[PDB]
Amino acid sequence: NYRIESDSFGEIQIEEKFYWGAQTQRSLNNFKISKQKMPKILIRALAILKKCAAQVNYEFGDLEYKIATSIDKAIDRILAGEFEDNFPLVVWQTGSGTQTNMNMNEVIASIANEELTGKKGGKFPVHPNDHVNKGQSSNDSFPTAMHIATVLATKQQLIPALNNLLTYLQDKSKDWDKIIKIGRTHLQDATPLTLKQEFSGYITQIEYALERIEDALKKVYLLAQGGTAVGTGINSKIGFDIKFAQKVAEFTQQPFKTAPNKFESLAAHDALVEFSGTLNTIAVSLMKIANDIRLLGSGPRCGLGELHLPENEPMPGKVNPTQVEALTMVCTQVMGNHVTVTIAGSNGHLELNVFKPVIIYNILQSIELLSDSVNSFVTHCVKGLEPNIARINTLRDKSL
Amino acid sequence: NYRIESDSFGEIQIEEKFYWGAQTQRSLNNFKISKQKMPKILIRALAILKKCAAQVNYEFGDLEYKIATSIDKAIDRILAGEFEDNFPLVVWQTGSGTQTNMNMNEVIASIANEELTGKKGGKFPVHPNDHVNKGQSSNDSFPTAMHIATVLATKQQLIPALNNLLTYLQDKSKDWDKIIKIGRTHLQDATPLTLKQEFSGYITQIEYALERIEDALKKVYLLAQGGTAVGTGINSKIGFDIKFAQKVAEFTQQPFKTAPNKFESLAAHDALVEFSGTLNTIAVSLMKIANDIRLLGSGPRCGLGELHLPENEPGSSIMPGKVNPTQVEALTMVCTQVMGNHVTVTIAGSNGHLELNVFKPVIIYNILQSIELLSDSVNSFVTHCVKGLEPNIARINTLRDKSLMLVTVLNPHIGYDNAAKIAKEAHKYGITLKEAAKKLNFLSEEEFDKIVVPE
Amino acid sequence: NYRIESDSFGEIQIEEKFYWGAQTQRSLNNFKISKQKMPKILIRALAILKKCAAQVNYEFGDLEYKIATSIDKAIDRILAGEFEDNFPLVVWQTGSGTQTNMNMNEVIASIANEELTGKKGGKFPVHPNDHVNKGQSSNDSFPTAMHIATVLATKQQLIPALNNLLTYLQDKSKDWDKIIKIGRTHLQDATPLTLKQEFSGYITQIEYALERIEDALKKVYLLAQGGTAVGTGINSKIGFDIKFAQKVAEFTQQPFKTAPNKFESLAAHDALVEFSGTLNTIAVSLMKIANDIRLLGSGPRCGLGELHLPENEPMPGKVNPTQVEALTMVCTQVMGNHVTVTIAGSNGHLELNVFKPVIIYNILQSIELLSDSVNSFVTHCVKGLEPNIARINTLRDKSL
Amino acid sequence: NYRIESDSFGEIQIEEKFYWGAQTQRSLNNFKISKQKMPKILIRALAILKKCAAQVNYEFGDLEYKIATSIDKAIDRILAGEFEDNFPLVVWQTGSGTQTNMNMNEVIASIANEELTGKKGGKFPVHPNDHVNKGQSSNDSFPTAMHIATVLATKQQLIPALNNLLTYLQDKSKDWDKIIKIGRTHLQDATPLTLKQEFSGYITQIEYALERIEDALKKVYLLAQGGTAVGTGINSKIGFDIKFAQKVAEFTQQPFKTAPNKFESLAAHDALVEFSGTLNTIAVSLMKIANDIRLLGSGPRCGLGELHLPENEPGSSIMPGKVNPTQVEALTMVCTQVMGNHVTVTIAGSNGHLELNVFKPVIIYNILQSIELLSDSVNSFVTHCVKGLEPNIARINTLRDKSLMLVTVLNPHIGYDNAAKIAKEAHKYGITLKEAAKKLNFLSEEEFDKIVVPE
Ligand code: NA
Ligand code: NA
């Protein structure tokens, strides 16, 4: 039931049914720190990275045809979800992500070797380092995967989620221009505005959130691949950085390019600190929008009672704004995640920032929580918001 | 493969092999927000809570023998680990934890009903709300679970890990009193201290971490159970609060009591915000300790090189033979996670409204994560780094003698003027202070090392 | 109009009317970073430190009688507020506080020299380093002053302020047990509780805040003095640490003692990070209390309207809960101050944490803002809170 | 020595030499909360605001010639710096900034009334609310001032300081291309890079800081003025908003416009929260740069020793001759202050209620402080550290040759096996790779240095 693998530290046992190699197993044994594995979309991004690197390596004459093709077939299968069991390493590993890099290197080599020899594992004929990792360091590969992942998640999770919110905020309030409600400043009675007008503030906040995302992504399109170990490009052929980036742009259909200065790309993660800053602003916007709805839906008899919130689950008969609670909790999570990203980003030393996994784990969590909670909020709260017109009219007609 | 269940809102389908009910399945369908489930030890805390509440209810005559005994047996199976598949709800739910409370209520009833009738699910003979949740709200139950879980995790994970680090810091540095290294202030050359003395700082930081936890636990021992919906204790018999706390104290063997003021326990989580603050401080201490070990072991040739860190894996694919301080990296990364987790807890804690703070799941999720991560990573750091740390004594000595600031250790022993002559001679010929001491016939190489000792 | 002073870097000009010396002026010229000077109470604490050190030095036989007496007279005058013009250095200086240490050393020497020779300044007969700073480093003196200051401010500003709040929360609500109001969970109508009961939550929060302060001060009583440059005590006579601490305990009438491990005292500021943690919890408590009052006083016609807040200043006739706004802003300040203290505390290197001035500036600001805002809040809001009983009764009698 | 004034609440005394009125003195007596006054540049912004609002009002025919001209002349004297004593109110006031708005309204009226009548104070001929505050609320005025001040400070303090740092990073490192130092990853010995290349990272961080500011300013150019109380623009004539923005654009020479949606501008300060986020990133960049320079200049003998930092003062009283990297300490301390200031702004920004975010003073206070501190400290760091940085070239070379990881730079030039023999020889005899290269007749001391160059 076991296979033996090795590296420069010696022999090590791996359970036969798993495709990973000596360094993954070594990491798996030595870092028994909680159960948070690397996010699926990061693994996906890392797989895309190896795919594109292999193609460039092949085109440069540096890989045998059968090895390049076997690596490519092997990676296509990972992208289809066939080896989700085979990336067991935790986030809390080496700060450069070396081990997760080797996790991808070894699994690809292993699948390819099973195709070519009939048996998985090992370094023949496909070597994890000399073929799958050819011309790469973890120091430039892991940041490249961090940026690919961030872009993919933002374009697939967050931007649609915000557009879903924008659309329903627009559609619901289109005809609330006839509803004249009483404004509150300091929570004290103020002068009148329409309910549509009040909701137009929220619409502006979300529109502006979408604009901030576009500006924050500009540096996240820029990829470190080609800097190798310390930023100089040692062991990377001239042109690799540019051709790799074009390859990733073509597969993702996103405008990726190479980072003009690779030293800045390795030594720091300022792009992601800035990006996390935009996530934080979005958290602030949503906290305000959700809090107002909580407040306007308070009651039914001893609150404000201007809005009726959909009732989705069960002091019997009492129904709570549960979606607002889920969303406002996520907002507080994102704000704390941002402080972690800040502090980790500030702790770079010379040629390398070695806080990379904690940074990307927090970025990707914030994107996913914001997207999922907003979509839930729209479906189970915003879509069925109705104003209580008689209540709004009574409140207005009492104002001094 | 499906069973039908019902609540106030109507009919709903549950996959047959699972034990939860209608309200849990409803929540499962309505809060599809990522993948972060309630932590194992919080579910455990909540089960313990229900076991004790059912026994007190039974003592008050408010549960029949058949029902109280089956509830108790069902809960023991959950505490045995037999139903870890049956708590699927995410953290990002209602802010009171109602759905997770009800998840526990339904699963207990369901296990009991299978035992009594042969078929799982439903509300007869055992009813989730009327029996399992009798005399309880989620408003007082969930805060009770939060504190039980915090105490359990702190005592089972955190205190043992810090003591593990303490013991090995003490053991490893016992005989480092004769290793005389150079002090660095502002990262600039300073005067000497023993390697042991430098480690004594770290030891003190961990001893103080342990004291801080004991003070931080004081209010976490106090339980909300009995406040019910708003804190008034309506639908709760006089004495239930005290008798429930006693039971939990017996089962856990921890000094749990009831909170004097139930309103404070529902409306806020200041106790967990204070506790998070202590976790924050521990993160700050560990960051300093781990950073020093990394800095002291930097090299092997182009850095400081005073400590040899155990080499556990290959550090690089391009540069073979390179070994990195990977355990320090995992620990310092965790430290940054705890610092951020603390801000989340702070902000959530500050957003209470009137009778209830409804940010409860996110608060307890961060507290428990911070505890697990500090504990797991400290344990790993000890096993794979502290255990095998060795000083590079020859390198430590070389560096000590390079310091020009040794002059001020020489002043009281050799005289102010004479030390000045040595330091002048060392600048002119470009030699060490030791070599200049021997050159001018003031002090041998052995007499020089004795004066330099801290004393 | 100028006097010339010097140090090992050479000669430097000081305006004649000022008492400080070469190193203070040098710092004053080289760190032109905003206008935040060291807090008054820190300077005060540093002056107390030099007073007690001199007395111990004198008792050990290490100072001439006339110098010890002149130093003591000189310091008594600083404590009386006579040289508030003479500590111009900014917080954003060397991270060990050396320059502010020399600021105190030089000014004391200067005043003493004016007494003894008729002219201020210089190092004769009282030398800033060899007499006023005898047996001291900035590395152990500045942490000692940080802890003295924190204790003094907490005992003189914060503890009385919280007791003032506790007392008035108690007195105002004593007879609110007859007022039956409707409870709100999730801001939805709930079951009843008395107004006194609701206020008893707030009373508990403040009581518990007072208990947390006592626990957090335990390590802040422990003083670094005697560790000198790197923690070893080089150039400090045996017994100095203990006798100094007793001297400070006697002058302040507070239970100060020496730090058992001086290395921990220099290398880190974990005591203050923990203390700042308690300030943060207090900020959280007060934010809740103040927010509820904002909410319960909302109206007069379109809010909850359960409480009447005092009207202290001027949509004419509209009066806002201005004291609650001041207080809740301070709370957000304290929470951010706490993150600065955290991050700075985490950045220690080997024998010394060199973020000391930013840490103490934030600690002392949080104490002063919390105290002043709470006292203001009590005087201009809590003292005159009255319930609107008819409104409370109407709301209750509408509950489902 | 006193003058009497009045408002809705009654009679109140003001010291005679000051120009403020009844509402300012009331606020002065009721908010005795520490000492933190409104920043100079925010007061200036608010004056500019009133100058432009009065001119637009006059153009609409809603101020008489006498009154508009005297208002304009009074404001110019405030912008000249003639009344810096007359704005005593603390930051910790009402959350809308009403009292500071009224401080400006009263002082302008008072200066104008002295000019027109000979006696300062009061509300005739110039009335604080009816003339100086005409068509304005504090709800739209204070946010307008916040953005004007942020733009002014960013353009006058921050952008110049970052450009100053940029210019000197470029100038100092121009000819450091021939200095070949060793790279460190995980603080472990790695492969070489030029000193210039290492500095190129820092240069990139600052160039990107400047781009980030330009994007962050986009929404700060947009002004609330015209929304009045709740955002509807009641008591504001159509066109006032556009014409006010134009005037401010003319006076400042900055591209200010009116905010399309006034409700968003009153109810929140997301734009300043986003801007704070950019300041945060700049703090993170500077922390890395300053920390590296400190680490590279550590020593002078027992650390890294690659850079010589200019020595500006004595570092110690016990250890004479010790010099500390004091400018790096002041800058990194400021960085921690900005990071905390950002959390305050984030939390304050998140506590808006309906039509108004009433945490405005604390938000703008932190933003402006962060800008001033980053600017002042970067400027000082350049003058007193970056300007005079020199590499210690002999030390840089020594360290480079100690690296065992040079082997991988030798592989493509000398062959894999041959480099292995050199590294084996270097381990056996305990020498450098260069000495072992010459020993085995593979490579001279000059040919070795050429292969090592990054290329
Ligand atoms: Na987090
Ligand atoms: Na601050």
Residue numbers in the entry:
A (entry chain B), C (entry chain B): 3 to 316, 321 to 406
B (entry chain A), D (entry chain A): 3 to 457
What do the study authors state?
A 2.4 Å resolution crystal structure of R. prowazekii fumarate hydratase, an enzyme catalyzing the third step of the tricarboxylic acid cycle pathway that ultimately converts phospho­enolpyruvate into succinyl-CoA, has been solved. Two classes of enzymes, class I and class II fumarate hydratase (fumarase; FumC), reversibly convert fumarate to l-malate and have no detectable sequence similarity. Class II fumarases (FumC enzymes) are homotetrameric, thermostable, iron-independent enzymes with a molecular mass of 200 kDa. Rickettsiae are obligate intracellular parasites of eukaryotic cells that are the causative agents responsible for spotted fever and typhus.
The R. prowazekii FumC structure was determined in complex with the product analog malonate. Like the first reported FumC structure from E. coli, R. prowazekii FumC crystallized as a homodimer containing two subunits of the normally tetrameric enzyme, in which each chain forms an elongated central four-helix bundle capped by two compact domains at the N- and C-­termini. Structure alignment of the R. prowazekii FumC monomer with the human enzyme using MultiProt showed an r.m.s.d. of 0.99 Å over 92% of the sequence. The largest deviation is found in the C-­terminal region; otherwise the backbone structure is remarkably conserved, including the active site. The residues located within 6 Å of the ligand in the Rickettsia structure, Thr96, Ser98, Ser139, Ser140, Asn141, Ala231 and Leu358, are 100% conserved in the three other species and adopt almost identical conformations, even in the unbound structures: the r.m.s.d. for all atoms over those eight residues is 0.83 Å from the human structure, 1.09 Å from that from E. coli and 1.15 Å from that from S. cerevisiae. The only visible difference between the human and Rickettsia pockets is the tilting of the Ser140 hydroxyl group away from the active site in the human structure. A structure alignment with human mitochondrial fumarate hydratase highlights the close similarity between R. prowazekii and mitochondrial enzymes. FumC displays some essential features of a good drug target: it is clearly involved in a crucial biological pathway, is functionally well characterized and possesses a druggable binding site. However, the structural evidence obtained in the present study strongly indicates that this enzyme is an unsuitable target for therapeutic intervention against Rickettsia owing to the very high degree of conservation between the human and R. prowazekii structures in terms of both the global fold and the binding site.
